[PDB]
Design a binder for this molecule. Structure first.
Ligand code: 8EJ
Ligand code: OGA
Ligand code: NI
Ligand code: ZN
Length: 331
Protein backbone atom coordinates (compact mmCIF):
# COMPACT_ATOMS: atom_id res chain seq x y z
CA UNK A 1 0.00 0.00 0.00
CA UNK A 2 1.23 3.47 -0.94
CA UNK A 3 1.84 6.07 1.78
CA UNK A 4 1.00 3.72 4.69
CA UNK A 5 1.97 6.30 7.34
CA UNK A 6 -0.56 8.75 5.81
CA UNK A 7 1.93 11.59 5.31
CA UNK A 8 0.91 14.77 3.53
CA UNK A 9 2.38 14.55 0.04
CA UNK A 10 3.54 17.48 -2.09
CA UNK A 11 3.30 17.34 -5.89
CA UNK A 12 5.09 19.28 -8.62
CA UNK A 13 3.17 18.63 -11.85
CA UNK A 14 4.74 19.64 -15.14
CA UNK A 15 2.78 21.94 -17.42
CA UNK A 16 1.81 18.89 -19.49
CA UNK A 17 0.62 17.08 -16.36
CA UNK A 18 -1.39 20.18 -15.38
CA UNK A 19 -3.74 19.94 -18.36
CA UNK A 20 -6.02 17.12 -17.22
CA UNK A 21 -7.32 17.83 -13.73
CA UNK A 22 -9.16 14.52 -13.18
CA UNK A 23 -6.18 12.51 -14.39
CA UNK A 24 -3.82 14.23 -11.97
CA UNK A 25 -6.11 13.73 -8.96
CA UNK A 26 -6.23 10.04 -9.88
CA UNK A 27 -2.43 10.01 -10.20
CA UNK A 28 -1.99 11.56 -6.73
CA UNK A 29 -4.27 8.86 -5.31
CA UNK A 30 -2.28 6.12 -7.09
CA UNK A 31 0.66 7.37 -5.00
CA UNK A 32 -1.38 7.22 -1.78
CA UNK A 33 -1.94 10.96 -1.38
CA UNK A 34 -5.50 10.56 -0.17
CA UNK A 35 -4.42 8.54 2.86
CA UNK A 36 -3.26 11.79 4.50
CA UNK A 37 -6.57 13.56 3.90
CA UNK A 38 -4.71 16.53 2.40
CA UNK A 39 -2.16 17.11 -0.40
CA UNK A 40 -0.25 20.15 -1.63
CA UNK A 41 0.11 20.86 -5.34
CA UNK A 42 2.67 23.39 -6.51
CA UNK A 43 1.74 24.57 -10.03
CA UNK A 44 4.33 24.51 -12.82
CA UNK A 45 6.41 27.67 -13.10
CA UNK A 46 4.77 28.53 -16.43
CA UNK A 47 1.31 28.76 -14.86
CA UNK A 48 -0.57 31.68 -13.35
CA UNK A 49 -4.07 32.16 -11.98
CA UNK A 50 -4.39 35.70 -13.35
CA UNK A 51 -2.12 38.56 -14.41
CA UNK A 52 -2.19 40.73 -11.26
CA UNK A 53 -4.13 41.23 -8.05
CA UNK A 54 -3.93 45.03 -8.35
CA UNK A 55 -7.65 45.53 -8.99
CA UNK A 56 -9.46 43.52 -6.31
CA UNK A 57 -10.06 46.21 -3.67
CA UNK A 58 -13.65 46.94 -4.75
CA UNK A 59 -14.88 43.39 -4.11
CA UNK A 60 -17.52 43.56 -1.35
CA UNK A 61 -17.47 41.45 1.78
CA UNK A 62 -21.20 41.78 2.47
CA UNK A 63 -21.08 40.01 5.83
CA UNK A 64 -17.67 39.96 7.52
CA UNK A 65 -17.65 37.50 10.43
CA UNK A 66 -16.07 38.23 13.81
CA UNK A 67 -14.86 34.91 15.21
CA UNK A 68 -15.47 34.96 18.96
CA UNK A 69 -13.95 32.10 20.98
CA UNK A 70 -15.14 30.31 24.13
CA UNK A 71 -13.29 27.70 26.14
CA UNK A 72 -9.61 27.10 26.81
CA UNK A 73 -6.58 27.83 24.63
CA UNK A 74 -6.37 24.33 23.17
CA UNK A 75 -10.06 23.33 23.29
CA UNK A 76 -12.54 25.98 22.24
CA UNK A 77 -15.51 26.79 20.08
CA UNK A 78 -16.06 29.90 18.03
CA UNK A 79 -19.21 31.65 16.95
CA UNK A 80 -19.56 34.09 14.10
CA UNK A 81 -20.80 37.57 14.87
CA UNK A 82 -22.00 39.40 11.76
CA UNK A 83 -20.40 42.79 11.08
CA UNK A 84 -21.21 45.63 8.68
CA UNK A 85 -20.21 45.26 5.03
CA UNK A 86 -16.79 46.39 3.87
CA UNK A 87 -14.76 46.29 0.67
CA UNK A 88 -11.66 44.14 0.32
CA UNK A 89 -9.61 47.37 0.41
CA UNK A 90 -11.17 48.31 3.73
CA UNK A 91 -10.72 44.77 5.03
CA UNK A 92 -7.03 44.73 4.05
CA UNK A 93 -6.50 47.99 5.91
CA UNK A 94 -8.24 46.53 8.96
CA UNK A 95 -6.14 43.35 8.80
CA UNK A 96 -2.98 45.44 8.78
CA UNK A 97 -4.02 47.70 11.68
CA UNK A 98 -2.25 47.47 15.03
CA UNK A 99 -5.26 45.67 16.56
CA UNK A 100 -5.32 42.84 14.00
CA UNK A 101 -1.89 42.62 12.35
CA UNK A 102 0.41 39.60 12.58
CA UNK A 103 2.80 39.95 15.53
CA UNK A 104 6.59 39.90 15.17
CA UNK A 105 7.72 36.27 14.90
CA UNK A 106 10.80 34.21 14.06
CA UNK A 107 9.32 31.64 11.67
CA UNK A 108 6.17 29.60 10.95
CA UNK A 109 6.69 27.44 14.07
CA UNK A 110 6.95 30.51 16.31
CA UNK A 111 3.79 31.93 14.79
CA UNK A 112 2.02 28.58 15.29
CA UNK A 113 3.01 28.63 18.97
CA UNK A 114 1.63 32.16 19.31
CA UNK A 115 -1.61 31.19 17.55
CA UNK A 116 -2.44 28.34 19.93
CA UNK A 117 -1.29 30.26 23.00
CA UNK A 118 -3.26 33.42 22.25
CA UNK A 119 -6.05 32.79 19.71
CA UNK A 120 -8.90 32.71 22.19
CA UNK A 121 -8.06 36.17 23.60
CA UNK A 122 -8.77 37.88 20.27
CA UNK A 123 -11.67 37.96 17.85
CA UNK A 124 -10.39 38.28 14.26
CA UNK A 125 -12.73 39.15 11.39
CA UNK A 126 -13.05 36.74 8.41
CA UNK A 127 -14.55 37.41 4.97
CA UNK A 128 -15.68 33.86 4.24
CA UNK A 129 -17.95 32.05 1.78
CA UNK A 130 -18.13 34.86 -0.79
CA UNK A 131 -19.45 33.48 -4.09
CA UNK A 132 -17.02 34.44 -6.84
CA UNK A 133 -13.70 33.70 -8.54
CA UNK A 134 -10.36 35.40 -9.08
CA UNK A 135 -9.21 33.07 -11.86
CA UNK A 136 -8.80 34.74 -15.24
CA UNK A 137 -11.34 33.26 -17.67
CA UNK A 138 -8.41 32.54 -20.01
CA UNK A 139 -6.65 30.37 -17.41
CA UNK A 140 -7.34 26.91 -18.80
CA UNK A 141 -5.54 24.75 -16.23
CA UNK A 142 -6.79 24.21 -12.66
CA UNK A 143 -9.28 27.06 -12.94
CA UNK A 144 -11.54 26.46 -9.94
CA UNK A 145 -14.49 28.09 -11.72
CA UNK A 146 -14.21 25.70 -14.68
CA UNK A 147 -14.17 22.28 -13.01
CA UNK A 148 -16.52 19.44 -13.85
CA UNK A 149 -19.55 19.76 -11.61
CA UNK A 150 -20.51 17.37 -8.82
CA UNK A 151 -23.95 17.07 -10.39
CA UNK A 152 -22.43 15.89 -13.66
CA UNK A 153 -20.16 13.48 -11.79
CA UNK A 154 -23.15 11.93 -9.99
CA UNK A 155 -24.99 11.71 -13.30
CA UNK A 156 -22.00 10.09 -15.03
CA UNK A 157 -21.54 7.54 -12.24
CA UNK A 158 -25.09 6.74 -11.24
CA UNK A 159 -27.11 7.66 -14.33
CA UNK A 160 -29.50 10.14 -12.70
CA UNK A 161 -29.75 13.80 -13.69
CA UNK A 162 -30.13 16.14 -10.72
CA UNK A 163 -30.71 19.83 -10.13
CA UNK A 164 -28.04 21.98 -8.53
CA UNK A 165 -24.95 23.99 -9.27
CA UNK A 166 -21.61 24.36 -7.62
CA UNK A 167 -19.45 27.41 -7.88
CA UNK A 168 -16.33 28.67 -6.07
CA UNK A 169 -16.07 30.74 -2.91
CA UNK A 170 -13.59 33.43 -1.92
CA UNK A 171 -12.11 33.77 1.57
CA UNK A 172 -10.41 36.95 2.79
CA UNK A 173 -8.47 36.25 5.97
CA UNK A 174 -6.35 37.99 8.57
CA UNK A 175 -4.09 36.89 11.43
CA UNK A 176 -5.78 34.27 13.67
CA UNK A 177 -8.81 33.80 11.43
CA UNK A 178 -9.72 30.18 11.94
CA UNK A 179 -11.38 27.28 10.20
CA UNK A 180 -12.82 24.73 12.62
CA UNK A 181 -12.43 20.95 12.43
CA UNK A 182 -14.63 19.61 9.63
CA UNK A 183 -15.00 17.38 6.64
CA UNK A 184 -16.72 18.70 3.51
CA UNK A 185 -20.47 18.52 2.92
CA UNK A 186 -21.32 14.93 2.01
CA UNK A 187 -17.61 14.16 2.58
CA UNK A 188 -16.75 15.68 -0.80
CA UNK A 189 -13.27 16.68 -1.91
CA UNK A 190 -12.26 20.30 -1.72
CA UNK A 191 -9.59 22.24 -3.54
CA UNK A 192 -8.20 25.49 -2.20
CA UNK A 193 -5.96 27.98 -4.02
CA UNK A 194 -4.16 30.66 -2.01
CA UNK A 195 -4.28 33.60 -4.43
CA UNK A 196 -2.47 36.28 -2.47
CA UNK A 197 -0.95 37.26 0.86
CA UNK A 198 0.19 35.51 3.99
CA UNK A 199 0.17 31.74 4.56
CA UNK A 200 -2.50 29.36 5.79
CA UNK A 201 -1.56 26.54 8.21
CA UNK A 202 -3.53 23.30 7.93
CA UNK A 203 -4.07 20.36 10.30
CA UNK A 204 -5.53 17.10 8.96
CA UNK A 205 -6.58 13.68 10.26
CA UNK A 206 -6.24 10.70 7.87
CA UNK A 207 -9.68 9.60 6.59
CA UNK A 208 -9.07 6.09 7.96
CA UNK A 209 -8.82 7.64 11.46
CA UNK A 210 -11.60 10.22 11.29
CA UNK A 211 -13.74 8.43 13.84
CA UNK A 212 -10.92 8.78 16.40
CA UNK A 213 -11.20 12.54 16.07
CA UNK A 214 -14.99 12.30 16.36
CA UNK A 215 -14.71 10.28 19.57
CA UNK A 216 -12.34 12.81 21.12
CA UNK A 217 -14.56 15.69 20.05
CA UNK A 218 -17.54 14.07 21.79
CA UNK A 219 -15.47 13.82 24.98
CA UNK A 220 -14.18 17.41 24.75
CA UNK A 221 -17.49 19.07 23.82
CA UNK A 222 -20.00 16.98 25.78
CA UNK A 223 -22.96 19.39 25.63
CA UNK A 224 -22.51 19.81 21.88
CA UNK A 225 -22.37 16.05 21.48
CA UNK A 226 -25.65 15.54 23.34
CA UNK A 227 -27.27 18.16 21.10
CA UNK A 228 -26.24 16.56 17.81
CA UNK A 229 -24.76 13.20 16.81
CA UNK A 230 -22.83 14.94 14.02
CA UNK A 231 -21.98 18.27 15.65
CA UNK A 232 -18.62 18.72 13.90
CA UNK A 233 -20.86 19.50 10.88
CA UNK A 234 -21.55 22.80 12.69
CA UNK A 235 -17.93 23.80 11.99
CA UNK A 236 -17.31 25.58 15.29
CA UNK A 237 -14.95 23.28 17.29
CA UNK A 238 -11.17 23.69 17.64
CA UNK A 239 -8.71 21.26 19.19
CA UNK A 240 -4.98 22.11 19.26
CA UNK A 241 -2.16 19.87 17.99
CA UNK A 242 -0.95 19.56 21.59
CA UNK A 243 -4.32 18.21 22.73
CA UNK A 244 -4.50 15.87 19.71
CA UNK A 245 -1.05 14.50 20.58
CA UNK A 246 -2.00 14.10 24.25
CA UNK A 247 -4.93 11.98 23.15
CA UNK A 248 -3.05 9.94 20.55
CA UNK A 249 -5.02 11.24 17.57
CA UNK A 250 -3.12 10.72 14.32
CA UNK A 251 -2.74 13.98 12.39
CA UNK A 252 -0.38 16.00 10.24
CA UNK A 253 0.24 19.67 9.58
CA UNK A 254 1.49 21.77 6.70
CA UNK A 255 1.63 25.44 5.74
CA UNK A 256 0.23 26.61 2.40
CA UNK A 257 1.80 29.67 0.78
CA UNK A 258 0.52 32.02 -1.93
CA UNK A 259 0.47 30.36 -5.34
CA UNK A 260 -0.15 26.86 -3.96
CA UNK A 261 -3.13 24.50 -4.15
CA UNK A 262 -4.33 22.22 -1.38
CA UNK A 263 -6.71 19.32 -1.99
CA UNK A 264 -8.68 17.74 0.83
CA UNK A 265 -9.86 14.19 0.26
CA UNK A 266 -13.20 12.58 1.20
CA UNK A 267 -13.66 12.34 4.98
CA UNK A 268 -10.33 14.07 5.68
CA UNK A 269 -10.98 16.21 8.77
CA UNK A 270 -9.12 19.51 8.62
CA UNK A 271 -8.73 22.76 10.55
CA UNK A 272 -6.35 25.68 10.44
CA UNK A 273 -5.60 29.36 10.59
CA UNK A 274 -4.37 32.30 8.52
CA UNK A 275 -1.05 34.03 9.20
CA UNK A 276 -2.11 37.52 8.09
CA UNK A 277 -4.06 39.21 5.30
CA UNK A 278 -4.74 36.78 2.48
CA UNK A 279 -7.22 35.63 -0.13
CA UNK A 280 -8.08 32.04 -0.98
CA UNK A 281 -10.54 30.47 -3.40
CA UNK A 282 -12.07 27.07 -2.81
CA UNK A 283 -14.68 24.72 -4.22
CA UNK A 284 -15.94 21.19 -3.62
CA UNK A 285 -15.56 18.53 -6.27
CA UNK A 286 -16.15 14.81 -6.75
CA UNK A 287 -14.53 11.83 -8.46
CA UNK A 288 -15.80 8.27 -8.95
CA UNK A 289 -14.05 7.30 -5.68
CA UNK A 290 -16.16 9.86 -3.78
CA UNK A 291 -19.48 8.11 -4.41
CA UNK A 292 -18.99 5.51 -1.65
CA UNK A 293 -18.08 8.28 0.82
CA UNK A 294 -21.15 10.28 -0.19
CA UNK A 295 -23.32 7.23 0.47
CA UNK A 296 -21.91 6.83 3.98
CA UNK A 297 -21.52 10.46 5.06
CA UNK A 298 -23.04 11.23 8.44
CA UNK A 299 -25.43 14.18 8.58
CA UNK A 300 -26.49 16.92 10.94
CA UNK A 301 -30.27 16.92 11.36
CA UNK A 302 -30.46 19.13 14.48
CA UNK A 303 -30.86 22.27 12.39
CA UNK A 304 -27.52 23.96 13.08
CA UNK A 305 -25.58 22.90 9.96
CA UNK A 306 -27.82 24.52 7.31
CA UNK A 307 -26.26 23.76 3.92
CA UNK A 308 -26.50 24.71 0.24
CA UNK A 309 -29.46 24.00 -2.02
CA UNK A 310 -27.40 21.51 -4.00
CA UNK A 311 -26.87 19.13 -1.09
CA UNK A 312 -30.57 18.21 -1.23
CA UNK A 313 -30.15 16.08 -4.33
CA UNK A 314 -27.02 14.42 -2.93
CA UNK A 315 -28.87 13.25 0.20
CA UNK A 316 -32.03 12.46 -1.78
CA UNK A 317 -30.27 10.13 -4.23
CA UNK A 318 -27.38 8.72 -2.19
CA UNK A 319 -29.09 8.52 1.23
CA UNK A 320 -32.84 8.07 0.64
CA UNK A 321 -33.42 6.56 4.12
CA UNK A 322 -31.94 9.65 5.77
CA UNK A 323 -33.53 12.20 3.46
CA UNK A 324 -36.79 12.82 5.37
CA UNK A 325 -35.04 13.39 8.71
CA UNK A 326 -32.33 15.53 7.14
CA UNK A 327 -34.78 17.70 5.22
CA UNK A 328 -36.75 18.29 8.42
CA UNK A 329 -33.52 19.68 9.86
CA UNK A 330 -33.08 22.03 6.90
CA UNK A 331 -36.49 23.58 7.60
C1 8EJ B 1 -19.11 14.33 16.55
C2 8EJ B 1 -19.30 13.99 15.10
C3 8EJ B 1 -19.44 15.03 14.20
C4 8EJ B 1 -19.63 14.76 12.86
C5 8EJ B 1 -19.66 13.44 12.44
C6 8EJ B 1 -19.86 13.13 10.99
N1 8EJ B 1 -19.38 11.99 10.50
O1 8EJ B 1 -20.45 13.93 10.25
C7 8EJ B 1 -19.51 12.43 13.38
N2 8EJ B 1 -19.33 12.72 14.68
O1 OGA C 1 -9.74 28.41 3.91
C1 OGA C 1 -10.63 28.23 4.78
O2 OGA C 1 -10.97 29.09 5.62
C2 OGA C 1 -11.34 26.91 4.83
N1 OGA C 1 -11.10 26.09 3.66
C3 OGA C 1 -11.49 24.82 3.63
O3 OGA C 1 -11.98 24.26 4.61
C4 OGA C 1 -11.32 24.06 2.39
O4 OGA C 1 -10.73 24.59 1.41
O5 OGA C 1 -11.79 22.91 2.37
NI1 NI D 1 -12.86 22.45 4.13
ZN1 ZN E 1 -26.37 19.37 14.26
Amino acid sequence: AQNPNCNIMIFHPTKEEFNDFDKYIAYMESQGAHRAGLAKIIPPKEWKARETYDNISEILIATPLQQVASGRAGVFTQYHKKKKAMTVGEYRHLANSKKYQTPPHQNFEDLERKYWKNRIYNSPIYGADISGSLFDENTKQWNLGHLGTIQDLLEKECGVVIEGVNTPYLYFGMWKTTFAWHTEDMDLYSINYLHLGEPKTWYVVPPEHGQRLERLARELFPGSSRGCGAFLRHKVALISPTVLKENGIPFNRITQEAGEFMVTFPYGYHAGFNHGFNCAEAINFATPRWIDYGKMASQCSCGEARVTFSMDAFVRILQPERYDLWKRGQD
